[PDB]
Amino acid sequence: LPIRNIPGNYGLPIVGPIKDRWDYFYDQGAEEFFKSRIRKYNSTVYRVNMPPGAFIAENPQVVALLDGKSFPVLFDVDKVEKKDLFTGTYMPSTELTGGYRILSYLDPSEPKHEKLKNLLFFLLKSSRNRIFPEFQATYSELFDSLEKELSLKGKADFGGSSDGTAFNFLARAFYGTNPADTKLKADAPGLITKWVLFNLHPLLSIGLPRVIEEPLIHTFSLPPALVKSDYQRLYEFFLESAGEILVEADKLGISREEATHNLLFATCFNTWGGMKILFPNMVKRIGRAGHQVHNRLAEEIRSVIKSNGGELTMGAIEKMELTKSVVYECLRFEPPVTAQYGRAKKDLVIESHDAAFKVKAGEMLYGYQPLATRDPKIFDRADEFVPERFVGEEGEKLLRHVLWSNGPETETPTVGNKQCAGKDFVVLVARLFVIEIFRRYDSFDIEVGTSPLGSSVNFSSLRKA
């Protein structure tokens, strides 16, 4: 391929980044922010400032990788460092996480990265026999509550009930603990939300005018001290609930304190936060796919479950072709976490589809995943949600291009990479979500809107079987 100069510029100091930040949050939004510049530069690889800049990030300058050929460089640990850039060009204060640099911020070359990731592998593996009955029991309550709300109001706010459900499910599946039986009561969603806000506010817009938002959440960090006691409530819950997992932490040579802050982060930020983005988006997309798709999903899931003697099992789910594919299409069409960063360890040649580009050691690389996963030179009808995309031998090959987990879907998280530790779990619970919906309902209608993180979704009808 021809070597090309990386297009784009960073504009003037201070003023360049601010204008790019207004574009990103207010005047264009992220998708059009990235696409308008692809069109301008005639390149899917270019230089751009990324938020937050201001006083929170020291350097907003990145090289954006916005196609599915160049983006995978971000998985390659021989090529990029993955230290302290989970949230990009800035890092939330370790005051927010008990003074620790949590697993998600550690490079694979740090020994504690191996210990902590192995701990989460154990967390997940040791919960395998609770996932099914706990998901089915807690999500059954969710849908009871949603049917109730629909009959009262004529619509049912999904996100307003499903946040509690997700956390209840995680506590019971991961720790055999019902939050209702603890001091947390039903408080966890609110505590986690505030704490996540304190972590992620430099990257978020909450719909307020820019005159308020910019000074309040985009220039300076929100003080960690103001969430410290909310965090302590969550910490004490993990300390008292994580008994069996803490013995294994002890065996792995991890302090009880470090294990607990890490278990909290993994459950509350990685898992519950990812679920908080994913499930309402799934409802939105599946809802938009229409009633014929719902009926086909319903017929598949029910038949397969009946063929399995009414028992839902891991192996039964492998039969549910459209179900597996729909889940994959949700993850491709709309990756829940869109921002992946990596610092070039050495000088690199990054190939895109029509040119190659030279980056120097130390440059921050950034990918906006939905432009890699909706890349029209990799996927046909790339901006269409196609439920059956991954069905059959030929569709399954395309999975290596589904990147939600910070790696190809065909690859496994290891202690050596930075691929999502809960990869298999996420795909599992997302499938169980679809299974629970369509073993109850032949179809549904939604009303949708925007959320600071993902989507705001209402059911306006739920057609029971």
Ligand X SMILES: CCCCC[C@@H]1O[C@@H]1C/C=C\CCCCCCCC(=O)O
Q: Which stretch binds ligand X (CB under 6 A): 65-73, 134-142, 267-275, 455-463?
A: 267-275
HEC string of the chain equals: CCEECCCCCCCCCCHHHHHHHHHHHHHCCHHHHHHHHHHHHCCCEEEEECCCCCCCCCCCEEEEECCCCCHHHHHCCCCEECCCCCCCCCCCCHHHHCCCCCHHHCCCCCHHHHHHHHHHHHHHHCCCCCHHHHHHHHHHHHHHHHHHHHHHHCCEECHHHHHHHHHHHHHHHHHCCCHHHCCCCCCHHHHHHHHHHHHHHHHCCCCCCHHHHHHHHHCCCCCHHHCHHHHHHHHHHHHHHCHHHHHHHHHCCCCHHHHHHHHHHHHHHHHHHHHHHHHHHHHHHHHHHCHHHHHHHHHHHHHHHHHCCCCCCHHHHHCCHHHHHHHHHHHHHCCCCCEEEEEECCCEEEECCCCEEEECCCCEEEEEHHHHHCCCCCCCCCCCCCCCCCCHHHHHHHHHHCCCCCCCCCCCCCCCCCCCCCHHHHHHHHHHHHHHHHHHEEEEEEEEEECCCCEEEEEEEEEEC
- Known binding residue 117? Answer is yes
Residue 269 contacts which entry, ligand X, ligand HEM, none (Cβ below 5-8 A, type-dependent): ligand X
| Residues in Cβ contact with 228 at an 8 Å cutoff, skipping those fewer than 6 apart | 95
Q: Which stretch binds ligand HEM (CB under 6 A): 62-70, 147-155, 336-344, 389-397?
A: 336-344
Cβ atoms within 10 A of the Cβ of 111, count?
Answer: 11
Tell me phi and psi for residue 141, to 5 degrees: -55, -45
Q: Is 203 in the site for ligand HEM (CB under 6 A)?
A: no
Beta carbon nearer to ligand X, 323 or 338: 338
Beta carbon nearer to ligand HEM, 120 or 283: 120
CA 98 from chain center: how many Å?
A: 23
Residue 19 Cβ vs ligand HEM, minimum distance, rounded to whole Å? 26
Residue 453 contacts which entry, ligand HEM, ligand X, none (Cβ below 5-8 A, type-dependent): ligand X
Residues 263-282 that bind ligand HEM (CB under 6 A): 266, 270-271, 274-275, 278
Residues 271-310 that bind ligand X (CB under 6 A): 273-274, 277
Tell which one of 71, 86, 333, 368 touches ligand HEM (CB under 6 A): 86
Q: Which stretch binds ligand HEM (CB under 6 A): 14-22, 112-120, 175-183, 360-368?
A: 112-120
Q: Is 79 in the site for ligand HEM (CB under 6 A)?
A: no
Per-residue contact string for residues 57-96; x = within reach of ligand X by CB under 6 A: -----------------------------xx---------
Q: Is 328 in the site for ligand HEM (CB under 6 A)?
A: no
Residues 326, 434 contacting (CB under 8 angstroms): yes
Residue 203 contacts which entry, ligand HEM, ligand X, none (Cβ below 5-8 A, type-dependent): ligand X
Give strand pairing partners of 48: 62
Tell which one of 420, 434, 437, 453 touches ligand HEM (CB under 6 A): 420
- Known binding residue 153? Answer is no
- Known binding residue 423? Answer is no
d(CA 22, CA 435): 41
Per-residue contact string for residues 155-194; x = within reach of ligand X by CB under 6 A: ----------------------------------------
d(CA 107, CA 208): 36
Q: Which residue has the tokens 């679920």?
A: 275
- How many amino acids of this chain bind ligand X (CB under 6 A)? 14
Q: How many CA atoms lie within 13 A of 84 on its CB side?
A: 9
d(CA 351, CA 353): 7
- Known binding residue 113? Answer is yes
Beta carbon nearer to ligand HEM, 98 or 336: 336
Beta carbon nearer to ligand HEM, 50 or 420: 420
Per-residue contact string for residues 194-223; x = within reach of ligand X by CB under 6 A: --x---x--x--------------------
Q: Is 75 in the site for ligand HEM (CB under 6 A)?
A: no
Residue 87 contacts which entry, ligand X, ligand HEM, none (Cβ below 5-8 A, type-dependent): ligand X
Tell which one of 44, 162, 270, 352 touches ligand X (CB under 6 A): 270
Beta carbon nearer to ligand HEM, 217 or 266: 266
Beta carbon nearer to ligand X, 86 or 444: 86
- Known binding residue 148? Answer is no
Binding residues (CB under 6 A) for ligand HEM: these are: 82, 86, 103-104, 106, 113, 117, 120, 124, 266, 270-271, 274-275, 278, 336-337, 340, 405-406, 418, 420-422, 425-426
Where is the binding site for heme b, in residues?
A: 82, 113, 117, 418, 420
Where is the binding site, in residues?
A: 82, 113, 117, 270, 338, 418, 420
Binding residues (CB under 6 A) for ligand X: these are: 86-87, 196, 200, 203, 269-270, 273-274, 277, 337-339, 453
